[PDB]
Amino acid sequence: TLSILVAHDLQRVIGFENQLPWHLPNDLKHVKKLSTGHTLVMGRKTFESIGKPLPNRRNVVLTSDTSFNVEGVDVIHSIEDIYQLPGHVFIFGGQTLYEEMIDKVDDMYITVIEGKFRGDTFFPPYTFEDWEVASSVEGKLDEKNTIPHTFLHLIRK
Ligand SMILES: NC(=O)C1=CN([C@@H]2O[C@H](COP(=O)(O)OP(=O)(O)OC[C@H]3O[C@@H](n4cnc5c(N)ncnc54)[C@H](OP(=O)(O)O)[C@@H]3O)[C@@H](O)[C@H]2O)C=CC1
Ligand SMILES: COc1cc(-c2ccccc2)cc([C@@H](C)C#Cc2c(C)nc(N)nc2N)c1
Known part of the structure; x- marks a missing residue:
């Protein structure tokens, strides 16, 4: 199973x-639970x-760096390597990875942050014409979470 996991703002x-x-x-x-x-x-x-x-899951890093070695991290050097990973794989970012994978994933777990922030990296445009809303759940607004946000689960039609 191949899923995107991302949080993005209104833009x-x-x-x-x-x-x-x-x-x-x-x-x-939400990220930890999923x-x-x-x-x-x-x-x-x-x-x-x-x-x-992040403890208690497999951490896989895509890089061209043949010297890359970090304890508790597995390394891959090709997009093709992703399809060989067993179990439920979540594409975790960033912009480059999302651009490379959005047309390939089964589904997407998107936290829509209902604000407009200054950014330098973006999730690629997508249309609900292509995606069914499996669920849409409002996040709770409080003292520690003060930005409105919605958890979407989208499945490719
Ligand atoms: N809001 C959110 O849900 C999330 C936001 N982010 C944000 O995204 C931003 C970073 O995104 P971006 O700058 O695109 O960086 P990425 O994290 O996508 O890293 C890009 C690097 O990944 C490696 N890579 C990507 N594709 C390939 C490939 N096909 N083959 C080999 N290596 C590859 C390369 O590493 P190398 O150069 O070493 O070869 C490349 O420079 C940050 O601001 C971060 O905070 C990230 C995750 C989630
Ligand atoms: C080194 O590996 C990482 C670990 C974390 C992380 C660390 C602690 C708690 C939760 C996530 C976050 C990240 C960042 C880049 C991310 C993300 C992300 C978030 C915060 N929310 C959603 N919905 N999707 C994501 N991909 C990378």
Whole structure:
């Protein structure tokens, strides 16, 4: 099973200066819950923006760097390698990986952040003509999560 897992704003911003532009604990929980016991595949820049693997799942980094070696991280050097990974694989970012994979994934788990942030990296345009809304769930707005957000599960028609 091949899924995208992304959070993007109203204009599809996903990043600014190698960080996420917003702080949303609800979405971090969502990510942890969805991907625990499974596999994350991410581009080299995305990995480096955090610098350590997320515990309790497989962390896979795509890079052309033949020297890349990080404890608790598995390395791949081709998009083709993704299809050989067993289990439920989540494409975890960043822009380059999403652009390469959006036409290939079975489904998408998207957190829509209902704001407009300054960004330098974007999720690719997509249309609901191509995607069924399996579920759409409003996130809870509170003191620690103060940006409205909606968890979408989209399945390719
Ligand atoms: N809001 C969200 O849900 C998320 C946001 N982000 C954000 O995304 C931004 C980073 O995105 P971006 O700059 O696109 O970087 P990526 O994380 O997509 O990393 C790009 C790198 O991945 C490697 N790579 C990608 N495709 C291939 C390939 N086909 N073969 C070999 N290597 C490949 C290359 O590494 P190398 O150069 O080493 O060869 C490349 O430079 C950050 O701001 C981050 O915060 C990231 C994840 C989620
Ligand atoms: C090094 O590997 C990473 C680990 C994390 C992470 C670390 C702690 C808690 C949750 C996620 C985040 C990332 C970033 C780049 C991401 C993401 C992401 C988020 C925060 N939300 C959704 N909905 N999708 C994503 N791909 C990379």
